[PDB]
Amino acid sequence: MILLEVNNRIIEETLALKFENAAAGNKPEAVEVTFADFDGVLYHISNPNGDKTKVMVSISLKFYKELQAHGADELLKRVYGSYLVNPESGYNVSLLYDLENLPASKDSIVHQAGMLKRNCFASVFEKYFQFQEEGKEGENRAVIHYRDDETMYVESKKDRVTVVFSTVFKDDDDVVIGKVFMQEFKEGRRASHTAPQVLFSHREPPLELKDTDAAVGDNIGYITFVLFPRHTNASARDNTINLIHTFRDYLHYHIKCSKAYIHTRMRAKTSDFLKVLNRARP
Amino acid sequence: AYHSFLVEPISCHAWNKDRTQIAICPNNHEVHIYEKSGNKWVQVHELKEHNGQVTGVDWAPDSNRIVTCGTDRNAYVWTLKGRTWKPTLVILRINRAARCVRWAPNEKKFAVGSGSRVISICYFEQENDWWVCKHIKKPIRSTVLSLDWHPNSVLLAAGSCDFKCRIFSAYIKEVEERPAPTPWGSKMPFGELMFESSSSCGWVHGVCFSANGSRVAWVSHDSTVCLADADKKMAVATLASETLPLLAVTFITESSLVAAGHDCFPVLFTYDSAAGKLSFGGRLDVPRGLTARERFQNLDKKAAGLDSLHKNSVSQISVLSGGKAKCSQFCTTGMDGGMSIWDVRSLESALKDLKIV
Amino acid sequence: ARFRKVDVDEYDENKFVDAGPDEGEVDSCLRQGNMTAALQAALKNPPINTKSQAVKDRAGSIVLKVLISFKANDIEKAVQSLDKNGVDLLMKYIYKGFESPSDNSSAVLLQWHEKALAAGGVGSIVRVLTARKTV
Amino acid sequence: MAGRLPACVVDCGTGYTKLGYAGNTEPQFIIPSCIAIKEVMKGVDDLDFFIGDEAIEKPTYATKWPIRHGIVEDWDLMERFMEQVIFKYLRAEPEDHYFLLTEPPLNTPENREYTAEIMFESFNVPGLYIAVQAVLALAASWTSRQVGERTLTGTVIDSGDGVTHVIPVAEGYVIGSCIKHIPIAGRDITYFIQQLLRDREVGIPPEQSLETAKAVKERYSYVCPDLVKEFNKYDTDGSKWIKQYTGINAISKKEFSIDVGYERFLGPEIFFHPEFANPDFTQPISEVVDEVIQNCPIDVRRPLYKNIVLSGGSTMFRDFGRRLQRDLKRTVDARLKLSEELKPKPIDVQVITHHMQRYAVWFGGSMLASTPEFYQVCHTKKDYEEIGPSICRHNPVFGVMS
Amino acid sequence: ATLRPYLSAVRATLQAALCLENFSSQVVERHNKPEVEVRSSKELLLQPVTISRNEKEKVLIEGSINSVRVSIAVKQADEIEKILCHKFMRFMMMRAENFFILRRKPVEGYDISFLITNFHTEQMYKHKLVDFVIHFMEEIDKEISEMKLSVNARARIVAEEFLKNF
Amino acid sequence: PAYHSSLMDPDTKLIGNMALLPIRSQFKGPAPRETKDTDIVDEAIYYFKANVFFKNYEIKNEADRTLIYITLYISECLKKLQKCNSKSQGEKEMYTLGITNFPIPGEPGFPLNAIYAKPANKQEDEVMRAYLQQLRQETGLRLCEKVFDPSKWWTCFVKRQFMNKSLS
Amino acid sequence: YAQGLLTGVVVDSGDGVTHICPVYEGFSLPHLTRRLDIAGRDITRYLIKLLLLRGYAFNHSADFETVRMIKEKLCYVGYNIEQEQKLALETTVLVESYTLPDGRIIKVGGERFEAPEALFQPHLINVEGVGVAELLFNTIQAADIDTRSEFYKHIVLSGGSTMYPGLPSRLERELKQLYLERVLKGDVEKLSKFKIRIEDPPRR
Ligand SMILES: Nc1ncnc2c1ncn2[C@@H]1O[C@H](COP(=O)(O)OP(=O)(O)O)[C@@H](O)[C@H]1O
Ligand SMILES: Nc1ncnc2c1ncn2[C@@H]1O[C@H](COP(=O)(O)OP(=O)(O)O)[C@@H](O)[C@H]1O
Ligand SMILES: [Ca+2]
Structure with missing residues (x-):
């Protein structure tokens, strides 16, 4: 899955x-x-x-x-x-x-x-x-506190709709793993030129939110999805929503399964090492 | 000629007068005695008394008594009563593990080196009917690893973790006669320090007195072999090795020493009395013979990666016959559980380059 | 419990208890480009007895300065021009050097170890570990 | 943290895994403890797997059973299994829920560390508690009307499919040195009923012989008081004791019908007469329990006889407990007879049965994890990080005193 | 170019240090402790030595009469390597009882430490332990690199799977 | 445990160590005359379906040996009584198989020779051979007015062997 | 008597109690004699608690003997607890395997020196007062200021609970510590002259 x-x-x-x-x-x-x-x-x-x-x-x-x-x-x-x-x-x-x-x-x-x-x-x-579909710009953005310490910002612009996520990595090392995943999202258009654009900002929020009470810190990360009409129109709307509202959890889920995968690697290597060690016995 | 008694260490060994039986400690609280039957080895006795590992074993040849010491702080003298060995406790009065023990040539006393930084000289009294001991303390600063008696049964050599080789008088006027003068000195009252090596390097793993006792040799952890010459004002010849530390050494002639250690194989050292220089005489364990049977067996076939008989460190060496003046066969035991018998003449034949004495 | 805080062992009466090369002489050789010469001079009168770490770190630097100034292909010959005591002291210095990695100084120091090892055998390393009084 | 979200409760058995949230009476999912994989992993091949039923018939995947004798045998597989238990079924954000997992008695301390390494380091859970199955089964009996005082001292009779265990528990802690296993259980009752059907009924597709046996067992079986009187019932009025079992042939997709009779009570009987099916074991379960209780400390071998509890599918059998109590009482009484003859106070033998027996362990776990105490005894993420996985070696028992 | 020379220096030093023997305690009646750990007798301790490949990679070897402590500074180029290495070393230390020559914690300043005693050199061929340590150093670097490639490879597939579905 | 007989009496007579138990029969034989409504042949038939599953049987009375024999025989009758297409036909099989000479205590072929004392002399051999026959007769005669329906519930046991022993 | 002694102090610890019996050139001195409500049973009981925090739950009645056997085989007295703890937390050299009667194998480590520490720190097992060493110390200091030195250089252990490897050494160090603080008020200078030889007979 x-x-x-x-x-x-x-x-x-x-x-x-x-x-x-x-x-x-x-x-x-x-x-x-x-x-x-x-x-x-x-x-x-x-x-x-x-x-x-x-x-x-x-x-x-x-x-x-x-x-x-x-x-x-x-x-x-x-x-x-x-x-x-x-x-x-x-x-x-x-x-x-x-x-x-x-x-x-x-x-x-x-x-x-x-x-x-x-x-x-x-x-x-x-x-x-x-x-976005009615060219209604200037509308105040939606601020959804979907978790006690996480926030989602939705905003409509002339040709695109942006969804920003202010997420937390309780595990310090989970930031490092997260960055590897975010880097890949960032270059994602290299595999789907039509897909949403994705940005990522480590400790600080995008500049548009630097004046708000937005969170700042070592374990905080901001992810921005840039959705285009082909994703926000009446034909793609539902699929786009089912995807985007799961993203945050999708990122964290994969960070954890990745750590589980590394564990299997560590068991195999530690296991091999024990054989060599035992093989040194008379 | 190698034989495997077990795969764990042979902590220490001792052969009887005839070299008919060998006593070994298999990394245990016990001492197993093996006897040879035909070409096989057979365990004949099992001495169980020690409550800790046995670290030393010595066999007094004529009286046929075996002495042992262990990490349990005790020492036992064993006497063969018919068919079983019976132990007699010897209170050493130490509070740390015993490390080594050697009977004096006269079999009237035995010495124990221990972690109490002292040497316990024990002798028996035919009045109170038991064993007692005097302590040689000064100037010992650490654990005593090895001992070797001088042929007069009075002078005693000791190697310690305080990096020193020493000679003491273990004279006990209650079992022996005032001793005759020696180049080591004229005054030999009990505990007298006759000689002390000069150096602050390497634990002295082994010490050996030459056959006439005018020379003493010892091997240290800093990979050096030394020899003090009493006839040359106790001058000391030193030789630094290019290999691993030796743990055991013995004279095979007045001028030849054989040693073994962490390299896992015996090596020869010769002393030039005129130059006062020690020289490396070469490896003795080298990996086609002179006899029909030999030529057959030695022929190669078709087809622990070590090129030495022993597969781990050799920790003890003893002369089997020919004494220390002209040794003909010597024995090695080590951490691999093996016991090897080496023949000096064979080594000389197979090694045309070998030059003893 | 306060009485267990002190290490009485510190005062037990059974506890064991145990000036450098010529800076100019070396520089003189280095400047003239006589490497082997610089080495033999640097391996002279080591601070084995002074209890000062400053004097020791001094002899160490002079030695390190020479080893680093060497050309890879010329290390062997130099090492072979030393006697056994020399190689042992050298090895002791090569090890001292590993504790101060700098601008790839350890790359060459490993070349020195390789050659020093070939001359003095593992026995020379054992004597680095066994030294009570060292550089 | 005792908050708005209930703790997750996961009971991983040899055959089935029960999962759900604390407070509920039944598990939210009851799935086969199996994981189906493909068979040098690269990319995301490690994620291409299924679990439970979705994992039993998967055409292009190999089905594995990570658990044997109740203990994890393949940690890589157990770890992946948990990934779906959390993200696919429970749909729990693992960082917001305390977890209660179970372990058989005898599970090693190392295994608890391995379990914690997974829960804290892969899933970053805030709290973890590992409860032993037997204790939870005891806690589960607190639901019965027969008991009026909560206690964690008792004899647990756990019978699944492989082996049946007689586990003596004293004050929340299994007396491991006194456990006894019985070579009779679910699979032994199924194999037996299989033979009985062969030696009589026709129509059962030889390919679905085991299926039919296991089916009839849990649909018609039960424990009777006397074999002859019973055989006398089915024969005198067979029209009111013989049942029918229609089934579907695999290849022909056709409903075949067989008769169910003597096996109904003969199946379960092997518990009391092992010799009926096992040539090597002949101790009636009533005797084994007695033996176990007699081996335990004198001061506890009475509170034990008074609180015998059941857990596992194999104890669902109507009258299993009644028959167990009767037999055990005849033994214990017979013994105290020769003492008066050859006046010890009578021995009160009680076997508790209740409605939550099929999933007694998960039930007990669910009831305990929905209490404040649970949050106090659980080891936190903080304790795990500051002290290490060794803290999970011991899990304080709770729920009784207060 | 600097790997083989580094491992060769380390291997030789390990041979020099792994020359141990059983040693009953001198300070405590009937005790037997690894002197390099308790250090209650200075004369039983050998001179600590270091072999360094560069400013980052190095091996600290501490010998004594009956035990040797070996600490390794593992190569960690970037952050993902740093955290993978830390998780991997932690992973092995947690299993120290099975990996009997490993310290449960590294010496301050290193990523992983071994404690090889005389009992180990008595029960295993000492030249095979030396081989193991060298083998270990090489293999952890390799595993860490594979782990790194794995996290990156799975990350790309994860980003595409999500992006390609819009 | 297994089901035992309760017909043993202080006055019951013995033939070998088997109880010479009374049987309400007409067939010739040394079986005493039974006045009551139930004899050892009834018990055996009643307890069969149950007893046949046991592998261990404690012998408490010489009557149990008699009960064990009838039990083992009932199975034999089932062997034949199985492939029969009429109660009357089986009535002749029980007669035919009743006269057939099965092994007895002391002979090879008779299981349990360690439990059953063999005939001490020629008289006992004949009397025991007769008591057994008479039992195989009455037993087989009562087993038909059961197995037949004016039954697979009697045929299913055909493959089961009491104590894993057989008269065949 | 055995050691040829008429005056000295006997420290005796058995399965049920610990007594410090001073004796002067003839007989005991009931006035100085003391008692420690901590001994064999207590250590064995404590080991049971320690092994529980380790994941092995032994019943206090059903397994008492088994844990006692483990204690006799693997337990010992720590000399420097700070050093012992470091060996337990940082290495595995203390870990030993022990096969239980049913065949299962368990691993015992730090608890080996932790259980017997109860003798020196009663509080560990909820007992009041000072430890055996401090008690011994006080007993001697509370005696004839003329026969003190005689006592100190003649302390003899007796009983099963006095066989723990390292015990003699621990006592000495602890006494030396107690002396340095309560008799020399920090004057390390004159500690070297203090004589304490705790006899450890090969027949305890
Ligand atoms: N109602 C029932 N009556 C009798 N046996 C049952 C009943 N339900 C289930 N069983 C049996 O209980 C046993 C459960 O075995 P298992 O697969 O290990 O389940 P779990 O892992 O949950 O203990 C099987 O033999 C199953 O056939
Ligand atoms: N080797 C040992 N190390 C520590 N304790 C031991 C040892 N051997 C026996 N014990 C303990 O010593 C006690 C028995 O000693 P003993 O003096 O006979 O008791 P008591 O004097 O009360 O009869 C028991 O607690 C036993 O477990
Ligand atoms: Ca379960």
Whole structure:
């Protein structure tokens, strides 16, 4: 697995099992599940008021208000329609499935439910893609604190939309490994001349943000993605979003798997060394 | 002629009067005695008493008593009662590991060098019925690694980690007679320091007295072999080696020494009495014979990468026959667990260039 | 616990207890380009007895200055012009040199080690480790 | 750190791996402990692998089982396995979640360091705790209505597929020197039922003989009190004891139907009568438990008899515990008979059974990792960095006293 | 051009230093300790020597009557090599009990250290240990380079896989 | 453990070390006359399906030896009774196989010669041979009004050997 | 008696208790005699705790004998704890293998000298008072200022818990330290004249 998956398996598999049983005609079993997703996301699937014929799926994001100021509510409503109900206390968005009133094809809803998180992030990107497509420049950028100490900046310009990530490398040595990966992103057009341009700035943020309360420090790194109309138009929009909103975690995921790969190399070499050593015995 | 008794070290060894039995310590708290049966070796005895590793073993030829010392601070005299060896404790009065032990030629006393920076001279009393000892302390500053008695059973040579080779009087007027004068000195009261090497280099791993005792030799960790000549006002000949440190040395004539060590093979040294110079006589273990059987075996076949018999450091060497005046056969034991028997005349034949004495 | 802080061993009564070449003479040879000569002079009267590190680092530098001033292809011959005591002292100096790597001085010093080793054998190195009084 | 995010709980067994978040009653995923790879790695070949079910039938990949006898045998494979457990299934940002992993008793201290080297140095987790399976199984029994006092002193009867273990535990710490293994377990019950079906039923595709056996076992088997009286039931009223099992032929894609009878109670019986199937082992499980408890310290060989707990698929069998308690009590009583004859206070023998037995270990782990105490005993990233992986050698037991 | 000359000097020094023997403690009744570690008897310690290839690469060899300590300064050209080397040396030190001649920690100023005692020279051919140390120095440089190429190769594939999907 | 017989009595008679247990039968033989509703042949048949799986059997009474013999025989009857297409046909197989002379204690072929005492003289040899035959008769006669349905649940054991021994 | 002594101090440590019995040219002196509530059982118990922090959990009752055997075979007294700790943290020379009764092999290192340190630092195992050395010291200093030197140069160990390699050496160093601080008030100058020879008989 190179690219991170977009959908949440716990959600889909939980709803599928319940839908499969409601269709078979079995008495509904109670469901109570708490789980998470990347970036501080907390979920809750349960039976509101103990009614086993109802299954609620709720998501909690510490930064939901910021996404709300950028069309999150409207977008979630277009997608989920009547499945979207008043948010369960402690969460920002709640989907309610009536096991007694399910659609003929329970497939697209199970799929859309699995993308609750992704759909919560969707609007901020759509809003700024639209700006670029309407030549509306000068619009204040979106500032999303997707993690306690990380920030994403979205901004629309005349011919391009930029997404900036201010990420942290808790592990000091993870910065060094990260730079190797960032260098490759930087020269990426050498393999896809049409793909987004990618910049990287070690301790300091891009100059446009040097006047804001942006973070500075040895374990901080800034990555900028420059998206073009071919990526922000109505035809590529969704794929572009599924990719871009996973980037941050994609970078860190690969930094870690890389360290796991080096471990296998170290086991093989240390192992070989032990044989030579033992081979020195009479 | 090499034989492998084991693969771990032979810490120390000792042969009886007839060279019919060899006592070895296999990196243990024990001493195994091997006897030869036909052309094979057979273990006949197993002396278990020490509670630590055995570091020295010496066999008094006529009385047939074996003495041992170990890291357990103890020493034991073994007597053969019928078919089994029985140990008798000898309190050395030391608080550190014993390192070496040698019976005096007269078998009336034995000496133990230890980590207590002292040498314990032990003798028996036929009144209280046990062993006692006097300590030779000054001016020893470190662990005593080796000993060798002078033929008069009084003068005693010692090598220490304080980089010195010394000769002391171990005279015990309760078992022997006032000793006769020697070029080393006329005054030999107990503990008297007769001679002390001059140098602050290398632990002295081994010391040996020539057959008549007028010469003393020792090998140090700084890869030098030395010889002090009492007939030449105790002048000292020194020879610096181009190879690794020697750990054992012995005279094979009044003017020839054979030594071995970390290089893993015996070498010959000769002394020029007139020039007072030590010279490298060459390697003795060199990798087609004179006899039919030999020519056959020595013929090469078709087809531890070391070109020496021993595969690890040789730590001890002893004269098997011919004494130290005209040695004919000598023995080597080492950290590889091997024991090799070398024949002086064979070496002379196979090495036309060899020049002894 | 305060009483265990002091190392009483420091005062035990059973513990063991153990002026350089001519700067001008060397420079004179170097300037005239007589390398071998400069070396033999530099390997003279080493500070084996002075307890001063300054005097020792001085003899070391004079020696190092000569070794570095040598041409790779001329090291052998020079080394072969020394007697055994010379080679031992040389080796002791080559080792002293490794402790002060500079503008590739160790590249040539390794050439010196190679030749010094060929002349004095591993025995000469052993005597560097065994020295109580050294350069 | 005890925060808004629940800890991750991963229980890696020999056959299946249970994973999910602390607090939940069932695992969120239960997958085969296997990883399928391709077979000098370059680029990202190390990432081309699958795990669990996705890894069992993969046409162009070779299926490997990193775990044998409950212990990691291939660390490279275990490490990659964890990558998906975290980033693909749990979907947990590993730096925000404390982790609770499990280990069989007897797992070496070195292995704990190897495990920590992975969790802290590859995945940079903030906290790690390695709990021993048996202890968690004890903690799991605290859910039963039979117990009113929490305790980590008991006898754990763990039976998976390979071997069954009788593990005595005293105050949270397994008494390793007194463990005993039994050459009878899941695979022995399956192979046996296989023969019974062969010597009678026809239609079972010889290629799916094992499948059918393992299926019938966990769908119809159980433990009866008396073999003859039972054989007397199936024969007198066979119309209300003989069940049917229809299955799918592989090649023909056709449903064949066989009868299920005597094997129903004969399968599980081998626990109490090993001689039925194993020519080398003949100790009834009731005897082995007794033996183990008798070998333990005198002062603890009573709290043990009173708290016998079950864990593993092989203990799901209806009446397994009841039969175990009965037999063990007949033994212990018979013995104290010859003492009065040849008046020791009677021995209370109790075998606990509960609803969370299939995944007792993960359940216990999930319940313990969702408490404040868990966060106190876990070793932190900071402690790992300042003291070293040796701190993970010991994991303080908790959950009882307070 | 400077590799072989460097390793040759180091190999010869190792032969000189690896001439050990069993030595019971002189300071502690019935103890046996590696003198180069405890250093409680100055006369048992040999002169520390160094072999350097340049300002960065070097080997410190400390001998004593019954043990030798060997510390190596590994070549680290840039940051990725520095961190790979540190992780690799840490990796081996953690497994020191299996790699019985390794110190659990390097001597201050070095990346990795060995502690070879008389028991080791008694149980293994000393010339094979010397071979191992030299072999070790060469092989770690090679492994570090391969690790470096790996991280770069996987990084390129990772950047493309992501970029090519837009 | 295994299922044992409870028919042993202080007055029960012996033939070798096998219990000469009463059997409600008509066939000729030294078997005593049984007045009760159940005899050793009943027990053997009742406990068969269970006992056949055991490999170890403690002998507690001379009656157990008698029970063990009938048990081992029941299996034999199953061998034949298997390939039979009628209860009446099997009724003749039990008669035919009942008269067939199987080995007895003391002879090679008889498993368990270490457990069963052999006949001490010619009389015992004849009496024991007869008691055994009479048992093989009544047993085989009761085994038919069972195995047949007016059964694979009796045929399945055909491959199982009690104590891993066989009369064949 | 054995050593031909009439007056001296006997330090005795067994499986259950430690006594410091001073004796003057004839018989004991119950007034000076002292006791240390730390001995064999205590060290063995402590080893068990130490091995637990190492990943080996031995039951206190079920395995007591096994851990006792490990103690007798591998434990010893440290001379300079700071130096011992460095050998344990930085190297592996202290690590020894030990085969348990069931065949499993465990590795024992620093705990080898750590368990017996309890004798010198009771607090380590939650016991009050000073260590055996300090106790011995006080016992002697609290006696006839005329028979002191006689005592010091005649200290004799007895009992199973006194066989730990290095014990005699540790005692001496500790006493020398106690003397340098509490009898010479830092005057290192006159330490060399202080005589202490702790007899370690080959028949303890
Ligand atoms: N309900 C059940 N009744 C009896 N046996 C079962 C049941 N469920 C599972 N089993 C058996 O439990 C055993 C589980 O073995 P294993 O694959 O090792 O699982 P795990 O690794 O989780 O312990 C198998 O023999 C399986 O057939
Ligand atoms: N070699 C040894 N090193 C340390 N302790 C030992 C050794 N041998 C025995 N012990 C311990 O000494 C104690 C037994 O000594 P002993 O004097 O017989 O006890 P006691 O005097 O109370 O009967 C036990 O704790 C035993 O484990
Ligand atoms: Ca498990």
